[PDB]
Ligand binder design. Sequence first.
Ligand SMILES: CNC(=O)COc1cc(C(=O)O)cc(-c2ccc(C(=O)O)c(OCc3ccccc3)c2)c1
Length: 242
Amino acid sequence: EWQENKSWNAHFTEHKSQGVVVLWNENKQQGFTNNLKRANQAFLPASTFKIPNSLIALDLGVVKDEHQVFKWDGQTRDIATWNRDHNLITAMKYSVVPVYQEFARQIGEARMSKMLHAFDYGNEDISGNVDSFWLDGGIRISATEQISFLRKLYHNKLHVSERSQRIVKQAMLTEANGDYIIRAKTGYSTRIEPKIGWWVGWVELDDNVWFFAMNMDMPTSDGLGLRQAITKEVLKQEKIIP
Ligand SMILES: CNC(=O)COc1cc(C(=O)O)cc(-c2ccc(C(=O)O)c(OCc3ccccc3)c2)c1
């Protein structure tokens, strides 16, 4: 049910890069990765944590729906797309940390820990600051654990309302055409070593879904586009996307 494919390493090496890609064929119920050890090593989730954070805020009513506007606080931050009003859709798309920090403060440590325990999310550990533990606290999750979480989400099995899960899957929409739909969430972990980039989600086909979770070493922000690029090359090699 798990199978290693060292050939994908060619795509990391081609870009002077290091990391892991994990795929899960939902229909056949089996998985593939270029590095079984790394696939199960636990990293900070960073902004991939916006998937559970969104689910929790929605189910608790911290966020009423995907249209509720979170007004820019007027602080001019380093990322231009952060210096504006957001809803849940745009906050997810632009990884607007300060919006989700407000969610986390509203959720609170007790509810947050209870929820992550209910989700079986990673090591279920929120130690650190209530509004940054997923970037520099004690929470950790592996690429394999990301897929297990993402499969519950896809099937509406997580303990939150089906409504919450449908809203978050809508907000995860990243790309779609006649050939496929990608629902995914990037992450960029820079506060604690090793600096890594993440991309987790799934590719929806006509008659199957391919879940994926990748992380890679990311010493500089200049290589952030490699998250999607290397993932897509793997997908093409496997004839999942054209
Ligand atoms: C052009 N950018 C956009 O449109 C959306 O902007 C982002 C995209 C992405 C992505 O993963 O791609 C990631 C972030 C992001 C995530 C976490 C933190 C954190 O606080 O740890 C963070 O800190 C500020 C920062 C500024 C500059 C360089 C490094 C860090 C930024 C922001």
